[model samples]
Target: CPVNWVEHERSCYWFSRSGKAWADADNYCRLEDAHLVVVTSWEEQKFVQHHIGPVNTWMGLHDQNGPWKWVDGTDYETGFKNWRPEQPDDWYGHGLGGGEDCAHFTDDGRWNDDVCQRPYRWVCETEL
Candidate 1:
């Protein structure tokens, strides 16, 4: 793995030291020649949760365009997902003019959806 990057399993994870909205974070990853993290299995989620701990860190999974998809082109419908029970409710009380459309890692690595534009620390992913 590169300097300052976390390495585990098959890839490198760049846990950002700053907070930004989903799109901005994604762009930052791209600028670094990586992409927002794409989790595809239980073990990967476990590793991520352990490192991310209890903060609401951004993940590539989201439904901003109406259906959940990974920004890195992972098969979200068939890939592993760790959403909490009854989660992604698309709650609409944030006065953000729409339902929650972004996904993040909550406590215990459980996935949750929130306003896509809200600021949060993000992780980036790429090859070893």
Candidate 2:
């Protein structure tokens, strides 16, 4: 099938070199019948970090309105969380002016909530 995907567990992943806003990246993944990477474990997180290195990449976590949730509408809870210290500060209020609603993987493999409109590389995931 000429697929350019990396296999892990029961899914395949693709890392993008092009940068896009979080919304745009999400849309792109949908177009591919996939979705933004929804990391749920330390092993998965380490896999992503090893592949992308010290580059920031969009993940499937966001808090556009209320508490942070995955793209599939699942609430992000305690056990599977991996945030950098003081992250998700939601630095600004939710308006066109400010507010960090999107999550991205930092260079150190920790998560950070950032403005959704900012451009960044992204990873996509699809079932095997």
Candidate 3:
């Protein structure tokens, strides 16, 4: 596995060593002067998948009550998505008072919409 931070393409990526809620993860990245990883391409997705292992990892994608959006403001309209089939189902069974509004890379690297309050590993991206 690579170190905490790695630069790929023109962006710098930092794989977190700890888990946090989606919102906490987002704030942590911003504290480090980056945003939660906003993967926008197959290349970026593959690169990120290579770094994160067999665990769910938070990315910048989330929906606060509307259409999905990247925390860094990447208009999700054309944003690259690798969601697993039937995912983003926004399953409401979590009893968190709402459906899943946060996105994370599940095992095998496909995305899923999960509750934001749940803790998971995360990555940060700085456009270098």
What's the CA error at residue 47 for candidate 2, in Å? 0.8
TM per candidate comes to: 0.94, 0.90, 0.93
Global CA lDDT of candidate 1, please? 0.89
Root-mean-square deviation of every model: 1.1, 2.4, 2.3
TM-score of 2: 0.90
Clashes of each: 0, 0, 0
Clashing residue pairs for model 1: none
Question: What lDDT would each prediction earn against the true structure?
Answer: 0.89, 0.87, 0.89
How are the candidates ranked when ordered by TM-score, highest leading?
1, 3, 2
Lowest lDDT block of 10, candidate 2: 71-80
lDDT of 3 by residue, 84-104 (tens): 999989898877787898999
Worst 10 residues of 1 by lDDT: 60-69
| Leading candidate by TM-score | 1
Flag clash pairs in model 3: none
Off by over 4 Å in 3: 1-3
